[PDB]
Amino acid sequence: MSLKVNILGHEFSNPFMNAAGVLCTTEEDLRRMTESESGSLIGKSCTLAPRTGNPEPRYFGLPLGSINSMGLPNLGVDFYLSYAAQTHDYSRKPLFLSMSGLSVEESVEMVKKLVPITKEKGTILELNLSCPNVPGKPQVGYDFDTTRTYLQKVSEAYGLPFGVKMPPYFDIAHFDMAAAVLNDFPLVKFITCVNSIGNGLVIDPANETVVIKPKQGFGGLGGKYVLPTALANVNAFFRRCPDKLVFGCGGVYSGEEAFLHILAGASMVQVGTALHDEGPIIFARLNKELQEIMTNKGYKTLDEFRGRVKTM
């Protein structure tokens, strides 16, 4: 039996990694992910200059998941580049970096700086087009003209295969339009579905008050709230972009949800809220539960059922 994944010119010991933004902001975070049993890791969505993010409280754990308005707290692109160039142990596992410039001009400058490091070390880019928590910064992925611009400029400046983190879509026309944009960019080699469900609102009935401080209580939803939306997006892009990989992100707490994501088309599976709750020990448990499920079904590799969800 094998959980191995061969994509992007690497072998991954297994399909699992952190969701961007969870256990990946500091060198300590990145160390703990690296020493984890995860198949991979991705660094926090970073910006050209450092950010401290939004005021507190900006995260709230819920029975069904999470709400967050972190505000892109990050140590700045130079930290993540130095990590990727100097610190990270590639014999342990491949590294992704997430980048979330707040304008096309900022993204261009950042990805340009990654090029030499990708060439030397094999560091992979995930471009974040779906941050829902910086005030006055709408989600790029909900604007297909803007999205086309970022993909054009990043394809030109970076010039190497990369991936995109997408916001959830909820309409077939949007799947169609998103894919038509993504299919115009041959350098877009994977699509991560999905970022949090943007701009939810949680209120505490006892004190009649929102639970997070920024944006009048409005923040992105992670966890159990997101699983059906995540599965849909994964499968929708899996079908519409056959020449690209899809990565699954959303609602994974167990081997079973990972199995569903893979069945829908996911090559890699990212874990956010659950990892924030349980710590990097989850990767060991997820490998065991996924192997258990496969053993029960008599599957020996992921390739036996990846993308084989059945319709009626």
Ligand X SMILES: O=C(O)c1cc(=O)[nH]c(=O)[nH]1
Instruction: Read off φ and ψ for residue 250, nearest 5 degrees.
Output: 140, 125
Closest C-alpha to 266, from 251, 239, 247: 247
Q: According to CB under 6 A, which residues from 163 to 202 bind ligand X?
A: 195-196
The DSSP secondary structure of 109-148, one letter per residue, reads: HHHHHHHHHHHHH-PEEEEE-----STT---GGG-HHHHH
Q: Map residues 14-33 to x or -, x wherever contact with ligand X holds by CB under 6 A.
A: -------x------------
Q: According to CB under 6 A, which residues from 96 to 155 bind ligand X?
A: 128, 130-133
Task: Please choose which of a second copy, ligand X, ligand FMN, none residue 191 contacts, taking the beta carbon within 5 to 8 angstroms, the exact cut-off set by kind.
Answer: none
| 144-158 vs 172-182: helix crossing angle, rounded to 10 | 20
Using rule CB under 8 A, residue 248 touches a second copy = no
Task: Report whether 54 belongs to an annotated binding site.
Answer: no
Q: Which of 46, 131, 193, 241 is catalytic?
A: 131
DSSP bridge pairs for 246:
191, 266
3-state secondary structure of 254: coil
Q: Catalytic: 241? A: no
Task: Using CA atoms of 20, 248, 301, 95 in order, give the dihedral in degrees to the nearest 10.
Answer: -20
Contact residues for 190 (Cβ-Cβ < 8 A; gap 6+): 7, 8, 126, 163, 164, 244, 245, 246, 247, 267
Q: Closer to ligand FMN by CB, 249 or 290: give it.
A: 249
Q: Residue from 71, 94, 101, 200 that binds ligand X (CB under 6 A)?
A: 71
Q: Closer to ligand FMN by CB, 60 or 144: give it.
A: 60
Instruction: Report the binding-site residues.
Output: 20, 44-45, 68-72, 128, 133, 165, 194-196, 223, 249-251, 272-273
Q: Footprint of a second copy on this chain (CB under 8 A)?
A: 57, 64, 67, 132, 135, 138-139, 142, 167-175, 197-203, 205, 207-210, 212-213, 215-218, 221, 224-225, 228-229, 231-232, 235-236, 239, 256, 259-260, 263-264, 293, 305, 308-312
